[PDB]
Amino acid sequence: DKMDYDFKVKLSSERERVEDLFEYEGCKVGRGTYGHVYKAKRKDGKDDKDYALKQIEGTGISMSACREIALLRELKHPNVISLQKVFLSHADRKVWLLFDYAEHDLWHIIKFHRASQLPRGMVKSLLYQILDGIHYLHANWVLHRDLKPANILVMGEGPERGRVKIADMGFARLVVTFWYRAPELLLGARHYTKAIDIWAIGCIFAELLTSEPIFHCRQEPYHHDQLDRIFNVMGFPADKDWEDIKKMPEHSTLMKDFRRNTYTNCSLIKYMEKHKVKPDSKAFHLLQKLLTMDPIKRITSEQAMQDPYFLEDPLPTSDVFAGCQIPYPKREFLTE
Amino acid sequence: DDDDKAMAGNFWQSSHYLQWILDKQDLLKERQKDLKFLSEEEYWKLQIFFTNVIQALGEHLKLRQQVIATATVYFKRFYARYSLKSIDPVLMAPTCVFLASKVEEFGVVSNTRLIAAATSVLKTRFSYAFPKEFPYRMNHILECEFYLLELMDCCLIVYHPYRPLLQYVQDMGQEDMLLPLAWRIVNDTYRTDLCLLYPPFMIALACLHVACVVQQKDARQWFAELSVDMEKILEIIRVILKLYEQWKNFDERKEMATILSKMPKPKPPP
């Protein structure tokens, strides 16, 4: 070991432990490959506020875990989730992250409406805050890489009532679903770009407007059935519409397995009409500029925020819910 | 290859600014616990030595200078708060490589290769300082990693004067003259402790000025087009010029056994 004793014990005496500071046992609200999340409360009567306790998978600290902590320690924006504290457990080598607690998110909000529709003022306001947060990330050269409804949190009753909070940005390596993935990644592209996040925003926005995931797909580098669905909503891209598709690693696999004629009466206009969204509307036209096949023809985070859709009545609001009661149920706990 | 651009243009709200620009007197007051054993002189020599370890390993592991810069500040930041006796600087050396190469997404340097990287740099480049084999194994790095993480309050994103340097030259247009020299002067500033006292844009303008002297480039007019503190910039130049007179007189290879034996030794358990 060869470390100083007085250094170890002093640090060991003063080190704060997550189990001493927080009541979380039995309060598990989330499970996954990453590990576990609890809705925790402090054991003292200092404040009755809630917190999100993420216990990370594995001993030591992974590159992903290092990257999440590094970025979260610097990022500061109203629509990006805050790291309060990090606990390091020298006994068992586990790492815990303390976040502010988000009661709701797009995954659960959407599931409620699909089990029923989203007020349109609420959609606009969600979209604007998602764009506000992603623009902040992109201005700081941080890409999300895996933007989904389960990442876009919404704060429940509290001082930040109805505020979007984005999580899990900037550390995803390249059943799991590809419904929010851009076609360049499906056709073999080997790196993350700002365009990839914008496609994701395009997919989320469509689903906010209809309640169906626009590229919903069967569960199974190159993903046939996913692309089939993309071309059935969007149409098959013309050479002019995406010229560098030829440069994609899986272009020759695309020509083998597909034929342009199969998707000949398919287009985004025809898709959205079936879900009662009028293609003369500013909403559709913004959606079409986000959901563009060719990534270099896809608009930016800031350009989206300047869109006239957000100057059309109603304006978006700080409170996504816009005053009226939240009908969405709170998070139920887990057991296994 | 390519380097991590994340958080570029937000030093002013960074963990770096708001917690790791440390007042000079505070830094020297914590050092007085170690100056019982080593002199003020022997101590700055000790920095230069370890800085060069954090470079050798960093070269051996094929890492980029931006990783290394960061690795070297992690190291510095630790021993600007804790005594040399606390954790071995040999052990901390590559624990800083390891973490930095993860923090910036360069890679998880494997176990086996981190340790032979360790053994080899010491076996070859430093057999004057450390005779016998590098004694530690991966569990020691892993433990040391948790302490390292704890001290910095997980402030892992760091900066170096490189990125602002590149911005400054691209006005003057002397990439075929200035940049190479300036870039090494910024490298050499890591032998000293300016990166804990000074924001990097200034360390860049300091190195760029010394460069302009060495190659007799007239850059006077350009330096007077900056709404910046030129005294604080002049403070850094002194330190940079002194750095080279110290280099001239410091015989690392003839002096470092003796300086390391004088380091305060860890207290063992009961």
Ligand SMILES: COCCN1CCCC12CCN(c1c(Cl)cncc1-c1ccc3c(c1)CS(=O)(=O)N3C)CC2
């Ligand atoms: C690598 O990254 C792993 C952690 N990722 C995975 C997606 C969710 C997340 C962990 C929980 N998380 C929350 C935070 Cl920080 C604050 N408050 C609530 C949540 C939360 C809790 C549970 C929950 C959701 C959201 C939606 S869900 O379907 O996963 N589900 C049941 C956000 C990030």
